[PDB]
Amino acid sequence: ISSHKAFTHAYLSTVTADFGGDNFLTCPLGILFTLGILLGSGGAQGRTGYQIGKTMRLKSTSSSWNSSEAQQEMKSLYQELNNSLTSEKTFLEENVVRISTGIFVEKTYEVERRFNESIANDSEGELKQVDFSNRTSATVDINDWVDQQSNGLLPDDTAMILVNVFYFRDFWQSPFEPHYTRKEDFYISPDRQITVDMMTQEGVMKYGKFEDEGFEIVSKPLNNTRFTFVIVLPLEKWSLNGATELLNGNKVLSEYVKNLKETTVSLRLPKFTLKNTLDLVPTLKSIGVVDLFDPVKSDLSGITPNPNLYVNEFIQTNVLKLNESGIEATTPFSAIIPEVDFHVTHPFICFIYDQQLTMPIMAAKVMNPV
C-alpha cells in the first residue's frame, strides 16, 4: 500500500470514532502536507522527525532512522501530491484545489535561515512570526491569514500553532436548475425533522446498490472530471449501516467507485454548507506523532536553536458548500423516466473523490444539513 493511503486510513479510523453524533468533515491530505512539511523542510529532527516518518509510513524509516533520506523521501512525496492536485484548473482560471499550511511561531524564537528558505521555496507553505504574548493581535493575524485562504468563507505561553486549510472549488459538470429547488423534509432522527432546500435533477450518472452493506451510491462529476462528488446513502432512514466503514476507511472507497454503472437517476440533494475546525493533536498523538507536541521531547532544532519550541495546536479548518452551481461555487423538466430514485432525505456520507489518486480528498458525514 502507498504511504499516503496508509496514513489516510490510520488517520480516518481514529478521527471519526468520536463524531458518531455530529456532522463530520475532513481533508486527510492537508494533514499529510502540514505534518510532512516539518519533516520535509529539515525542521523536525531526531525522534520527532522519525515519528512523523513512521506515521507517514515512509520506506526510509521502515527499520531505522535515516534523517537525510527520510527528509528527501518526505519532501518528494509532499511535492508530488501537491503538484498533482494544484495542477488541476477551472474556468470561473483558478486552481480547483487550494492547499494552505500556515506555520505560526512566536517572534521571540530565532529561525534557522535554511528552514526559512525551505518554507519560502515551498508553494503551499507559509511561515509567519507572531506575538503570542499579545493574545488579541495574535488572534487577529491568524484569523486574517485564514480569511485570506478561504476566500472569505472561513492561550498564553503559546510557542507554535499549525493551521491547515483545504479549499476545493468547481462547477458541476451538470448543474441543478434552481427553479427545481424546493422545500422538503429531511429526516435527522425520530424526534427530529427539518426543512431543507432540496435540489432535484434527473440525469445520467454512475450508480450502484450494495444490499449487503446496506447502502447505495451515486457519483456526480465536477466540471474538471478528475473530481467527483460521491454520495453514500443508507438503504433505510434509521441507520448509517456500512456507510461508516467507507468514512473510516475500513472499506476501500475506490473499490466501490469502480463498480458503479451509468444509470438514469432521479436525484434529490439538499443544498448546504458545513464549516468546521478540527484539533488534530489527540488523533495525531494516537497514531504515533508524540514528541512534536511535547516541550521536553520536541526536537525542532532544524527550525530554531532556541530549545523548547514545540507545537501547541494543530488545527484543520474546513468548508463544504454545496449549491446548484457546484461546490464552493457561485452563480425544462427532463423527458427522462429514471430507473432509480436517489433521494437524499436522511443522514448520508459523502466524498470529494479523486479519480487519479483513487482516494477521497474530502470525507464528510452529513447528519444535519444547515
Nearest-angstrom CA–CA distance, 206 and 186: 24
d(CA 85, CA 356): 10
Whole-angstrom distance, CA of residue 310 vs CA of residue 298: 6
- Chain centre distance of CA 355: 16
Domain range 1-170+271-324, its CATH number among 3.40.50.300, 3.30.497.10, 3.30.565.10, 3.40.640.10: 3.30.497.10
Distance CA 220, CA 333 (A): 19
Q: Does domain 171-270+325-370 have CATH number 2.30.130.60?
A: no
The alpha-helical segments, DSSP class H, found in the chain are 3-15, 28-40, 46-55, 67-86, 113-120, 135-149, 243-247, 253-257, 281-286
- Residues, the chain: 370
Experimentally, the structure was elucidated by X-ray
Q: What's the half-sphere exposure (Cβ side, CA atoms, 13 Å) at 164?
A: 22
If you search the block for the grid coordinates 489516510, which residue do you land on? 8
Angle at 308 between CA 305 and CA 314, to 5 degrees: 110
- β strands within the chain, DSSP E: 24-26, 89-90, 94-95, 97-106, 125-130, 160-168, 170-171, 182-189, 192-210, 215-221, 227-234, 261-270, 272-279, 313-322, 326-327, 340-343, 348-354, 359-366
Look up residue 96 and give its DSSP letter. Answer: S
- Contact between 341 and 231 under an 8 Å Cβ cutoff? The reply is no
As a whole number of Å, the end-to-end CA separation of the chain is 37
Radius of gyration of the chain (CA): 22
Cα–Cα distance for residue pair 243/261, rounded to 1 Å? 19
- The span from the CA of 195 to the CA of 190, in Å, is 15
- 8 Å CB contact between 77 and 36: yes
Half-sphere exposure of 5 (CA within 13 A, CB side): 12
Residue 308 CB coordination number (10 Å): 11
Residue with cell 448546504: 272
User: What is the residue extent of each domain of the chain?
Assistant: 1-170+271-324, 171-270+325-370
β-pair partners for 25: 364
The three three-digit cell numbers of residue 267, written as one number:
436525484
Q: Which of 251, 229, 217, 258 is nearest to 16 (CA)?
A: 251
